[PDB]
Amino acid sequence: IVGEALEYVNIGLSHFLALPLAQRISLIIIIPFIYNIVWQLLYSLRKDRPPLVFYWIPWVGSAVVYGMKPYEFFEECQKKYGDIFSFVLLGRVMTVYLGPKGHEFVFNAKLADVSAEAAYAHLTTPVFGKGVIYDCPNSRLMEQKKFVKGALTKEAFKSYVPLIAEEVYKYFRDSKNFRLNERTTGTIDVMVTQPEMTIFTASRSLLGKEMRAKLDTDFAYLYSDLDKGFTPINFVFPNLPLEHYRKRDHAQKAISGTYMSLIKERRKNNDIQDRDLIDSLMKNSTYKDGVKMTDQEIANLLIGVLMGGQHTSAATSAWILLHLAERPDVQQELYEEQMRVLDGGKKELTYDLLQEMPLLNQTIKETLRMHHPLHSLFRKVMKDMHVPNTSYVIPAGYHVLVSPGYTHLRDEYFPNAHQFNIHRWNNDSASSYSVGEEVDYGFGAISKGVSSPYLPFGGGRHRCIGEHFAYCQLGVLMSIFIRTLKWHYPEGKTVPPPDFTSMVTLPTGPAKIIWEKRNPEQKIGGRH
Numbered sequence: 128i129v130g131e132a133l134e135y136v137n138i139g140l141s142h143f144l145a146l147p148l149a150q151r152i153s154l155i156i157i158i159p160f161i162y163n164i165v166w167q168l169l170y171s172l173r174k175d176r177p178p179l180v181f182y183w184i185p186w187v188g189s190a191v192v193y194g195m196k197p198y199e200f201f202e203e204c205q206k207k208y209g210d211i212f213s214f215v216l217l218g219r220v221m222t223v224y225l226g227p228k229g230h231e232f233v234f235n236a237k238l239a240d241v242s243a244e245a246a247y248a249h250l251t252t253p254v255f256g257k258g259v260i261y262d263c264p265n266s267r268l269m270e271q272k273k274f275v276k277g278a279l280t281k282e283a284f285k286s287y288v289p290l291i292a293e294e295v296y297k298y299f300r301d302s303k304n305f306r307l308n309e310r311t312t313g314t315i316d317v318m319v320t321q322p323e324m325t326i327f328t329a330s331r332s333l334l335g336k337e338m339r340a341k342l343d344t345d346f347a348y349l350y351s352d353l354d355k356g357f358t359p360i361n362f363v364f365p366n367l368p369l370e371h372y373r374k375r376d377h378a379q380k381a382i383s384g385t386y387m388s389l390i391k392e393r394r395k396n397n398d399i400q401d402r403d404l405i406d407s408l409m410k411n412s413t414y415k416d417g418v419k420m421t422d423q424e425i426a427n428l429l430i431g432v433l434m435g436g437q438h439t440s441a442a443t444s445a446w447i448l449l450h451l452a453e454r455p456d457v458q459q460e461l462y463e464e465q466m467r468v469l470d471g472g473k474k475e476l477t478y479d480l481l482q483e484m485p486l487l488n489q490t491i492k493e494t495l496r497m498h499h500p501l502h503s504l505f506r507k508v509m510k511d512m513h514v515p516n517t518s519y520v521i522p523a524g525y526h527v528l529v530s531p532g533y534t535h536l537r538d539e540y541f542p543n544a545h546q547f548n549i550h551r552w553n554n555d556s557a558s559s560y561s562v563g564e565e566v567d568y569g570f571g572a573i574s575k576g577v578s579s580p581y582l583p584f585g586g587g588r589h590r591c592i593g594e595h596f597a598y599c600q601l602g603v604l605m606s607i608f609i610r611t612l613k614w615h616y617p618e619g620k621t622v623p624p625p626d627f628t629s630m631v632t633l634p635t636g637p638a639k640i641i642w643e644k645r646n647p648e649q650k651i652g653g654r655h
């Protein structure tokens with residue numbers, strides 16, 4: 128007789144529901160806390176699952192330590208478990224595969240196994256708009272990248288270089304942070320100057336003179352509002368109604384509206400040349416199945432393409448300025464390269480001459496090695512994936528996290544990895560290179576192997592298409608900085624540590640350097 132025991136299950140439940148509000152709250156906390164803990168212990172039994180990092184608080188998982196110092200988190204985990212391990216992150220299970228094998232396993236994964244758009248769309252679609260990037264099937268993305276690459280050709284870069292140079296000089300002339308016709312020395316915050324210099328140079332050359340002229344007005348404020356939707360807090364709550372969410376949505380309509388306006392006027396005048404990305408997409412945005420991109424979609428694609436490049440590039444020139452500020456030896460060497468290639472300054476900077484500045488391109492390369500703008504790249508796992516040479520299975524619904532930026536900082540692949548050393552790239556100054564066989568996903572032949580320990584631009588179907596644009600812009604900018612200014616730190620200041628909490632891993636500010644003119648009496652012409 129134990130039906131008598133079932134009587135007391137019933138009675139027991141009855142007394143549960145009758146406990147005071149204090150104990151019941153105490154229990155709605157202690158009961159998932161405990162379940163979680165035995166669940167992990169039970170989980171670590173399975174040999175077909177990668178090791179899972181232990182955590183106390185349910186749902187939150189390892190969010191706090193990962194969110195604040197993800198490379199230290201990765202390293203500590205790698206010591207305990209090796210290169211494959213999992214951890215819970217605000218609701219989700221992230222499986223990290225560290226090292227070159229990890230790049231291979233994730234970047235070169237089969238289309239059917241993983242989805243970038245499933246990982247990213249909830250974050251990007253509201254910022255950029257509907258119908259493009261991650262708000263469309265992968266095949267559509269592939270053709271958009273193709274369309275955009277058509278405004279990123281060598282001949283495009285030859286015409287961008289003087290426009291970008293004009294903008295840097297205008298900024299030296301007019302911005303309160305410099306004013307080189309009035310001041311010979313000054314303090315700047317690189318996280319104030321570099322985003323402005325970036326948006327100004329990127330706008331003028333990819334969007335055109337009209338759009339660049341709008342940045343001189345209050346309209347510029349909308350791009351900032353748009354940033355606030357592109358944060359690792361929309362990370363988790365994609366849409367819950369308070370005000371910076373509205374300003375985001377408002378900015379998107381307003382900016383896309385403006386782009387659509389210029390598009391429609393250019394077509395109404397047949398004022399369609401080869402100046403911009405705008406001209407380019409208007410002439411070339413028909414998918415292979417014959418469907419044309421709408422004017423809304425084109426405008427949304429413009430926002431998305433310029434947003435990403437804006438923050439990665441601005442963060443990178445800020446890090447460059449910061450590393451160089453304590454290396455007058457490297458400024459000196461870069462300066463000598465400038466005098467030699469540009470014949471004392473008597474040659475005008477062109478895209479061709481940029482390619483003959485290996486030490487400048489190595490400086491960019493090395494900065495990107497020590498400061499990858501994105502410490503983590505994600506895919507949602509769509510089908511149970513087996514991990515080669517293990518018994519590990521990664522179930523659908525998990526996420527895979529790859530981190531080439533972590534490998535960038537390993538001594539095994541980069542001797543003295545925490546040292547800024549541009550000469551480690553002697554006779555290897557290329558932004559990237561395919562050491563063999565290629566493949567084409569729809570936007571041109573890129574490398575098939577994604578095993579390089581140096582992968583600032585990722586690889587596989589989702590690979591960056593902006594690398595050459597970014598070197599062009601960073602190149603021109605840094606060439607003018609070097610030729611015009613020397614700079615150094617305020618007393619006792621040094622290279623700041625990264626802030627990893629933002630979307631990109633910019634430096635912890637205020638990040639200030641002191642500039643001074645190389646030629647105090649040099650004037651920059653033009654009306655203002």
Ligand code: HEM
Pocket residue numbers: 243268272432433435436437439440443495500501504505583584585586588589590591592593594596597
């Ligand atoms: C230093 C500058 C940059 C760095 C380090 C960088 C890095 C990256 C990385 C790592 C990815 C791959 C993301 C993933 O696989 O999850 C990517 C993708 C991409 N980037 Fe860049 N990027 C930079 C600048 C730019 C610029 C200037 C542009 C445009 C002109 C651009 C446009 C794109 C596009 C369209 C993708 C495709 C993403 C996809 O297919 O899912 N990026 N970038």
Ligand SMILES: CCCN(CCOc1c(Cl)cc(Cl)cc1Cl)C(=O)n1ccnc1
Pocket residue numbers: 247250251260431432434435436439501503504505591
């Ligand atoms: C253009 C579509 C979104 N992208 C590409 C994917 O960007 C990412 C990356 Cl690389 C990581 C995470 Cl965590 C989220 C997003 Cl949206 C960009 O804005 N970027 C950023 C740098 N280069 C391009």
